[PDB]
RNA sequence: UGUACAACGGGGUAUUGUAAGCAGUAGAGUAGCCUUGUUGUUACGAUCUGCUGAGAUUAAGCCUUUGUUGUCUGAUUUGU
RNA sequence: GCGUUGGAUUGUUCACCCACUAAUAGGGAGUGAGCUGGGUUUAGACCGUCGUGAGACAGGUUAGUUUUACCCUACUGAUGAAUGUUACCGCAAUAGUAAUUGAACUUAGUACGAGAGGAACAGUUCAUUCGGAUAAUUGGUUUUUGCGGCUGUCUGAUCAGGCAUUGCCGCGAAGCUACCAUCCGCUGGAUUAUGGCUGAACGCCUCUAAGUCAGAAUCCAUGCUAGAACGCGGUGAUUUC
RNA sequence: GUGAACAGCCUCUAGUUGAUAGAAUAAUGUAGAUAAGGGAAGUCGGCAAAAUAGAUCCGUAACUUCGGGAUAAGGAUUGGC
């Protein structure tokens, strides 16, 4: 009966989202974030056991001069 | 129904069958009984007085040793 | 898997199993039921002329008498003399319900 | 599911297409049933409506009591020769595929069932479970 | 869940493995694999097929009557739960497997005692019977030592 | 003349063209919606599909017919050693779409990544990032400039990770590099996190955890040129039909005087990129932890590696992800595991998974034993033993 | 020029179903032989039993490898 | 948007019949030498009617060769030259798009009802059809000719083998594979009919004129597939005698 | 040699090893097989395949021109020693 795109069932889903489901998502995420912090701490703890530049400037200037010299510019003529 | 109603509804209330059975200790009310170990059915080896049969086996086996069964 | 085995041993063509036949042979009441049987329009010979061991029906007393002198009947008779292979035997062979297997063998041998 | 069926039915492998003779497990006097239709089946183009354990069919009594033949009564499949899966994983099958005569509301015409009855059919049909001496 | 045993070869059929056959008697027949299932459908005797445990028990290839093999039975009447009882059960099972492996090693050694002298009788009969290649052998070691000087 | 009997289309028109995927590693075309309130997290991961096995699960699904009943499930084991961050990419939001603004790499890159940048690694001088490590020497002025640029302008930050493929049983030494988007935290927080991580690894349990629904994005198994009867499921024509029976019979009408794009034709099957969503994580294993494959119902103390290893894949020595059901792609294949793009509202996404048992029997035959110890104790002593 | 790769080998893991050879009284019986006897005996004899879940196969798109032996080399082209 | 069946029947088709189904809607382009059945079915033959006849018909019955593409285009898949070279990581114009239906617990034997009977939303569980994958398991398959056996013959016998157009039989890993196996398939805007708000036209009124709220499986996006081979970005290395 | 056989299959004497080859093993074909459960529901039509099949023994209907039908039908067997 009621389709996937059904407004009624989607609205029941949306009411349900904000309850137990988003709670469980956010709590799960907090736990995984703490595990990541543990992981980085362990790794740093084993660690203690021991323009942009001239390249990009010439690159861009050449590219723009080639586009102006072959008449192939999106932005200028 | 009342506990079922305040915990989520008919199909959402996950009934704990464990919190109503009768033991010598409520602290092992929710403890998991193992089913399998090294290819053997734990339930089928499960027996009251298993210590008695086990100790009789141990006596017989160390007798077999001291009699010289694995020379 | 081939042709012959799948042709003969379908669950459609599955015949009576040996332990069931052993239990048919076990008591005098069941055997005397199986011999003096009610008439049955579907079964060959109207249900008379039954070979208990082979668990198949013959069309007449001639076909039964000829059946009892054949190597097929001998092969079936030999298959049934000892202790029928039940789940007791496949259980105790791995160390499981070994006691009931053993005393079942004793009961079979004594009766 | 059907009328008189208790709750949902999960998928099991279809064993009995239309035109399949199946044994009559009950004692209503029929000796075999001939599936002419299957309840609940979808409309796929060349697909024969097929029946499985626990499914209600429409069957004619082809051999047996003359008071029952030439009539089309509902039947409920209780055994099956096609191996299907049980969720506590095991694929199982019976030696024959059989059914029982039921009125469309689920009640057994017979007063008993002989031979085993699958638990997927006993569970789904209370009047089958209540008339089956052997389950699984 | 539990391990059932193949009705043919007594092998462990774990959950999800093999198939089962149910007769008109509610007697289930578990099979560990299609090999045993097909051999059963073909009415083959498992007590005459050497690779089954039933054959090895009936012929005496493996020990059959033992104290360690009686502990695993199907417990019809159950017992109430108890952590101490079940932990002693797990320890018991760990002990029983060790003792039964030792006893089956002993049984196999008993079965294969006597192989040494019979194999030696075969070797002595072969060496007695074939002295000509023994002379050939003597010559080959003689060549070996004559070569090994430098 | 109208179609006499209405039947639905064979196949899906949204999975077209059924061509070979442009790369073996399937792209992630969408990442979960960024929520800056949450802390910084990785939205995907990279692992290798090891194989499949069988699970008994103690199902707690209230309202079900299998409620409070053990159910046997098939699962897929994805070998997931930790991936290590090596770079950042900042994306600006432009009226023609997202645009990579800049990319900052770690100071030291392993051989595994550097191999990814060569077709002929053995012949090379291995000069991969030699002029780029020097940007860290001059107190990191260029590195800091591009990171400040990401902070100033980027509206999407993606980290660059890669797999320690040497930890897998794979013969391939060329690691797999990818962009993983960072969700949570502001742009500056994303960049600072990533800078802190430029040579540290990220374990799989720092991205996913048990009882989470994840998406599997992988290029499927390839089958070569395959005909209509099985590329689309078209019915076989009657026996000994002239010109053959494994092909579609009529192709077109008198008009449009062409074969339409919708008519099923033969061609490449498989090796297509697919995104399969909502795969429940049944176990996030740990590499160092022996008894990966043991549970609280099964005390055998065994790892998830089947006897004989997996088939066409070695052992599982690493962290792994075991997901319910089957996954696109075959074994040995790089898969991308993604966080779910939406807060799923099914009750399956909420369930805690309670395994009773993992099938570690051999996949190289009709395996009947879980451990070599069990096989030995069931066989008895052999002739190799005295 | 190496935790390299390869060809073999070893170990697992899987498939079959108990190898060749020898022995045995185990064996329907039939011949012969005398100690004419109850395992009488010498020979044949499908098959059976013991060595022996043995033997074979096992990546060719299985896993692993403290072993052995060898290889690491040519050709072509590409510049803002 | 999405589905619209299985059979029985007779020159066929509809009809009609039986049933299943959510429903078994009606049509176009249809598939005249893609494949096929009857008929246009040509020389054989038989019977009927007519004709003096040869014969032809009011008929009826029967048997009866038909042959792309290797060309172009379309379509399905697959390469690919050059825009310094080379490598990796991406963007997204455009184009395609997909999910579907049933009933089950609960709401309930409640609303509603003399009574017979008897809903639904919210909360849940499965299944039908479709689709996309996958091979843990089960089943199928076997030139693994992997193992074993059988027949006939040949290599003097044993061994070990040959041949029998893959000899046959049993089991058979791996691979392939099956609703014959298993998993997975969503959520935001804007609207239609309609229901309204404010409010003139028209000193009443009015959902409409200005303005505006809600609202269909609709549309457009999200998500999913391809990636413009003449769309683009970021980044790495850029030849020493 | 097997076998009833100048059948099929294997071999001795004699003859030949000639038919463009090599490498892969996609779809579709040509030729040949196997397939769970059901068993004609497929089709214009059981087309094609399957099933049957040698020999011995038991037994064998209607009808009939009394000759047949008839290998009717339906059963029981088959190795080795």
Clarify whether residues E59 and E111 are in a common domain. Answer: no
Please list every residue in chain B whose beta carbon sits closer than 8 Å to the beta carbon of residue E3.
36, 39-41
**Partners of F178 in the β-ladder:** F161
Rounded to whole angstroms, the distance from the CA of residue F384 to the C1' of nucleotide H151 is 38
In chain F, where the domains are located: 16-81+203-220+270-384, 82-202
How many domains, in total, are found in chain D? 1
In a domain, D7, yes or no: no
User: What is the distance of C-alpha C71 from the center of its chain?
Assistant: 16
d(Cα D74, Cα D84) in Å, to the nearest integer? Answer: 23
Q: Is the CA virtual torsion E9, E12, E18, E22 positive or negative?
A: positive
Q: Report resolution in angstroms.
A: 2.9
| 3-state SS track over chain F | CCCCCCCCCCCCCCCCCCCCCCCCCCCCCCCCCCCCCCCCEECEEEEEEEEEEEEEEEECCCCCCCCCEEEEEEEEEEECCCEEEEEEEEEEEEECEEEEEEEEECCCCCHHHHHHCCCCCCCCCCCCCHHHHHHHHCCCHHHHHHHHHHHHHCCEEEEEEEECHHHCCCCCCCCCEEEEEEECCCHHHHHHHHHHCCCCEECHHHCCCCCCEEEEEEECCEEEEECHHHHCCCCCCCCCCCCCCCCCCCCCCCCCCCCCCCCCCCEEEECCEEEEEEEEEEEEECCCCCCCCCCCCECCCCCCCCCCCCCCCCCCCCCEEEEECCCCCCCCCEEEEEECCCCCCCCHHHCCCCEEEECCCCCCCCCCCCCHHHHHHHHCCCCCCC
Q: Does the residue E123 lie in any domain? A: yes
* Structural domain contains residue D57: yes
Total structural domains within chain E: 2
Give yes or no: residues E103 and E80 share one domain. yes
Contact between D94 and D88 (Cβ < 8 Å): no
Spell out which residues of F between 149 and 188 contact strand G, using CB within 7 Å: 166, 169, 171
For chain D, the distance separating the N- and C-terminal CA atoms, rounded to the nearest angstrom, is 22
Angle at C21 between CA C16 and CA C25, to 5 degrees: 155
Q: How was this structure determined?
A: cryo-EM
Q: Determine the residue of chain E that is closest to D98 in CA distance.
A: E24
Instruction: Give the Cα separation of C94 and E97 in Å (integer).
Output: 12
How would CATH label the architecture of F82-202? 2-Layer Sandwich (3.30)
Q: Note whether residue D28 is domain-resident.
A: yes
Residue E94, number of CB atoms within 10 A of its CB: 13
Beta bridge partners of F357: F56
Chains that touch D (3 or more CB pairs under 8 A): C, E, F
Contact residues, E window 83-142, toward B, CB-based 8 Å cutoff: 83, 85-86, 88-90, 92-97, 99, 102, 105-106
Q: Is D65's Cβ below 8 Å from some Cβ in C? A: no
Q: Give strand pairing partners of C50.
A: C57
The residue from E42, E65, E88 where one domain ends is E65
Chain I bases closer than 7 angstroms to a protein Cβ: 26-31, 33-42, 47-48, 51, 57-59, 74-79
- Does any strand G atom come closer than 7 Å to the Cβ of F309? yes
Phi, psi values for residue B55, rounded to 5°: -70, -35
Q: Which of E26, E44, E65 is the last residue of a domain?
A: E65
- Fold category of F16-81+203-220+270-384 in CATH: Elongation Factor Tu (Ef-tu); domain 3 (2.40.30)
List the domain range (segments joined by +) for residue E16. Answer: 2-65
Range of the domain at D49: 15-136
CA distance B68 to B42: 32
Instruction: Tell me the CA end-to-end span of chain F in Å, nearest whole number.
Output: 83
What is the SS3 assignment for D61? strand
Residue F157: φ, ψ to 5°: -115, 130
Is E36 found in the same domain as E13? Answer: yes
* Cβ partners under 8 Å of residue E97, min gap 6: B38, B40, F377
Quickly give F268 CA vs G16 C1' distance in Å: 39
Radius of gyration of chain F (CA): 25
H/E stretch holding D32 reads: strand D30-38
User: Can you read off the two tokens belonging to residue F348?
Assistant: 């399956």
Tokens of F365: 């035959």
Contact F331, F313 (CB under 8 A): yes
């Amino acid at each position: 009966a009621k389709s996937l795109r059904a407004s009624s069932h989607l609205n029941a889903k949306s009411v349900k989202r904000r309850g137990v489901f988003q709670k469980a998502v956010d709590a799960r995420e907090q736990r995984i974030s703490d595990k990541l912090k543990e992981d980085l701490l362990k790794q740093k703890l084993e660690d203690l056991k021991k323009w942009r530049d001239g390249r990009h400037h010439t690159y861009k200037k050449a590219k723009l001069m080639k586009q102006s010299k072959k008449k192939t510019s999106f932005t200028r003529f | 129904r009342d506990i079922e109603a305040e915990n989520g509804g008919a199909g959402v209330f996950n009934v704990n069958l464990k919190d109503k059975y009768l033991l010598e200790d409520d602290e092992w009310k929710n403890d998991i009984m193992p089913e399998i170990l090294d290819g053997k059915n734990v339930y089928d080896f499960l027996d009251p007085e298993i210590a008695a049969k086990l100790q009789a086996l141990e006596e017989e086996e160390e007798k077999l040793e001291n009699e010289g069964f694995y020379n | 898997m081939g042709r012959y085995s799948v042709k003969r041993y379908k669950t459609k063509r599955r015949t009576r199993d040996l332990d069931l036949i052993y239990n048919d042979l076990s008591t005098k009441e069941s055997v005397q039921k199986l011999l003096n049987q009610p008439l049955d329009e579907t079964k060959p010979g109207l249900g008379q002329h039954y070979c208990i061991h082979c668990a198949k029906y013959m069309e007449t007393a001639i076909a039964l008498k000829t059946h009892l002198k054949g190597k097929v009947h001998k092969r079936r008779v030999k298959e049934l003399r000892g202790v029928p292979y039940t789940q007791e035997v496949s259980d105790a062979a791995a160390g499981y319900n070994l006691n009931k297997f053993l005393n079942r063998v004793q009961e079979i041998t004594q009766s | 599911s059907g009328n008189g069926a208790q709750g949902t039915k999960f998928r099991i492998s279809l064993g009995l297409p239309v035109g399949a003779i199946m044994n009559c497990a009950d004692n209503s006097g029929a000796r075999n049933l001939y599936i002419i239709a299957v309840k609940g089946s979808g409309s796929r183009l060349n697909r024969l409506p097929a029946a499985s354990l626990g499914d209600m069919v429409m069957a004619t009594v082809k051999k047996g009591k003359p008071e029952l033949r030439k009539k089309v009564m509902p039947a409920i499949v209780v055994r099956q020769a096609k191996s299907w899966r049980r969720r506590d994983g095991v694929f199982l099958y019976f030696e024959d595929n059989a059914g029982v005569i039921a009125n469309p509301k689920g009640e057994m015409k017979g007063s008993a069932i002989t031979g085993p009855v699958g638990k997927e059919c006993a569970d789904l049909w209370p009047r089958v479970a209540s008339n089956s001496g052997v389950v699984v | 869940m539990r391990i059932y045993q193949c009705h043919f070869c007594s092998s462990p059929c774990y959950p999800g493995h093999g198939i089962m056959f149910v007769r008109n008697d509610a007697k289930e027949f578990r099979f560990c694999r299609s090999k045993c299932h097909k051999a059963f459908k073909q009415r083959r005797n498992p007590r005459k097929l050497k690779w089954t445990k039933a054959f090895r028990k009936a012929a005496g290839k493996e020990l059959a009557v033992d104290s360690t093999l009686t502990f695993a039975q199907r417990r019809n009447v159950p017992v109430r739960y108890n952590r101490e009882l079940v932990a002693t059960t797990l320890k018991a099972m760990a002990r029983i497997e060790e003792i039964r492996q030792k006893r089956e090693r002993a049984f196999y050694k008993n079965r294969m005692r006597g192989n040494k002298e019979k194999d030696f009788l075969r070797d002595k009969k072969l060496v007695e019977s074939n002295p000509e290649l023994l002379r050939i052998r003597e010559v080959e070691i003689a060549r070996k030592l004559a070569k090994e000087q430098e | 003349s109208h179609r006499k009997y209405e039947a639905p289309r064979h196949g899906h028109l949204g999975f077209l063209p059924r061509k070979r995927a442009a790369s073996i590693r399937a792209r992630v075309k969408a990442f979960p919606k960024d929520d800056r309130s949450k802390p910084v997290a990785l939205t995907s991961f990279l692992g290798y599909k090891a194989g499949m096995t069988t699970i008994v699960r103690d199902l707690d699904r209230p309202g079900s017919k299998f409620h409070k009943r053990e159910v046997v499930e098939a699962v897929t084991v994805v070998d997931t050693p930790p991936v290590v961050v090596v770079g950042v990419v900042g994306y600006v939001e432009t009226p023609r779409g997202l645009r990579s603004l800049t990319t900052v790499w770690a100071e030291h890159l392993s051989d595994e990544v550097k191999r990814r940048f060569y077709k002929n690694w053995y012949k090379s001088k291995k000069k991969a990032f030699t002029k780029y490590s020097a940007k860290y020497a001059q107190d990191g002025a260029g590195i800091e400039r591009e990171l400040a640029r990401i902070k100033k302008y980027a509206s999407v930050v993606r980290v660059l990770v890669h797999t320690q493929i040497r930890k897998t049983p794979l013969a391939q030494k060329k690691a797999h590099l990818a962009e993983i988007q960072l969700n949570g935290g502001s742009i500056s927080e994303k960049v600072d996190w990533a800078r802190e991580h430029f040579e540290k690894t990220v374990a799989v349990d720092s991205v996913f955890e048990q009882n989470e629904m994840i998406d599997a994005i992988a290029v499927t198994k390839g089958h070569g040129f395959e005909g209509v009867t099985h590329r689309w499921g078209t019915k076989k024509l009657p026996r000994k039909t002239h010109r053959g029976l494994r092909k579609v019979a009529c192709i077109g009408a008198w008009h449009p005087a062409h074969v339409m794009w919708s008519v099923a034709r033969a061609g490449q099957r498989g090796y297509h990129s697919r995104t399969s969503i909502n795969h429940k994580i049944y176990r996030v294993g740990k590499g160092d932890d022996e008894a990966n494959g043991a549970t609280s119902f099964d005390r055998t103390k065994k790892t998830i590696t089947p006897m004989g290893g997996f088939v066409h894949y070695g052992e599982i020595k690493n962290d792994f992800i075991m997901v319910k059901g089957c996954i696109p792609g075959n074994r040995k294949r790089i898969v991308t595991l993604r966080k779910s793009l939406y807060t799923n509202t099914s009750r399956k996404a909420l369930e805690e998974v309670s395994l009773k048992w993992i099938d570690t029997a051999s996949k190289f035959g009709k395996g009947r034993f879980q451990t070599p110890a069990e096989k030995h104790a069931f066989m008895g002593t052999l002739k190799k033993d005295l």
